Design a protein around this ligand. Structure first.
Ligand SMILES: N#Cc1c(N)ncnc1-c1cnn(Cc2cccnc2)c1
Length: 295
């Protein structure tokens, strides 16, 4: 039989993911159905979101040739029934304290840093760029985790060197850009722009660099519809724009500038959002989500 989740020890939680100890060398990486918008975890879950994002991550791990932390199949008997399809058995690594970000387009904190200083994470950029400008080549824009409530802090390459070593910093930069370039080209061929992405890496017993966490989900990466890409304006979030529009619309009764917790979402908005996740997955993977495992 499959074990109960209660048989494993909880070791870490983020906004929408959970981590459990399985044994001395393995963890259970669990995606939930929670969704974040405007830095709030919302009251309303998105049905099947954890399963869809897990399916997405597994697809991209298989597409990339680099070592990763997966330690068994999606139906591995160590995975509890309750989280089947939204949990992965992974190898325990010594995690490197760097959020490895690649940006193919200028938006978010990258754009803000540019508009304030003309540079992003130590990269002095051409004049005349703006919202959703294409960056060629993609930029390595590393960050570090801050306090529980604060956003990650953008740092330059020298900071990464100070965190992990000179040779390892070069390796993180090179692998981050290589992996992003491959995945972004694949997605764009299928009609989706991966505008940026955030990786975490760890090191195994042999000193080898291993890709961990989740990769190229719409939570770790900005997904845009390529058919509507228009430099100079803010691009719609492929997955989250219905949620963002409703929350900031006339029907929510919520003022975002108040920074009070937002209200629950309409059922219709949650279902529409689920559909967007499935569309993105099926377009990128060429697979049917109806074939993905579940309880
Ligand atoms: N992946 C992975 C991993 C690994 N393979 N080995 C050791 N540690 C980690 C690890 C620790 N924290 N996080 C971030 C995180 C993930 C999910 C939920 N909350 C936080 C990742």
């Amino acid at each position: 039989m499959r074990p109960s989740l209660s048989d494993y020890q909880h070791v870490a939680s983020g906004k929408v993911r959970e981590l459990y100890r399985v044994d001395d060398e393995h963890l259970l990486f669990v995606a939930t159905d929670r969704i974040s918008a405007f830095d709030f975890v919302l009251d309303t879950p998105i049905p099947d979101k954890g399963r869809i994002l897990t399916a997405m991550s597994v697809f991209f791990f298989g597409l990339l040739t680099v070592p990763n932390h997966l330690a068994g199949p999606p139906d591995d008997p160590r995975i509890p029934e309750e989280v089947l399809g939204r949990a992965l058995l992974v190898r325990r690594l010594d995690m490197l304290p760097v959020e490895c970000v690649a940006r193919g387009y200028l938006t978010g904190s990258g754009l803000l840093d540019y508009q304030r200083t003309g540079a992003v994470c130590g990269h002095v950029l051409p004049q005349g760029l703006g919202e959703a400008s294409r960056l060629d080549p993609p930029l390595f824009t590393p960050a570090t985790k801050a306090d529980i409530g604060e956003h990650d802090m953008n740092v330059d390459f020298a900071a990464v060197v100070g965190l992990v070593g000179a040779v390892r910093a070069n390796q993180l930069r090179d692998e981050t850009i290589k992996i992003y370039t491959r995945a972004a080209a694949h997605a764009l061929h299928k009609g989706i722009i991966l505008a940026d992405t955030k990786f975490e890496f760890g090191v195994d017993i042999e000193g080898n660099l291993v890709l961990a966490d989740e990769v190229f989900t719409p939570d770790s990466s900005r997904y845009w519809d390529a058919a509507h890409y228009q430099p100079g304006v803010v691009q719609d979030s492929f997955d989250k724009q219905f949620v963002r529009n409703w929350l900031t619309g006339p029907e929510s009764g919520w003022d975002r500038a108040s920074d009070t917790p937002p209200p629950p979402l309409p059922d219709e908005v949650a279902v529409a959002t689920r559909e967007r996740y499935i569309e993105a997955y099926e377009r990128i993977s060429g697979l049917s989500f109806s074939d993905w495992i579940g309880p």
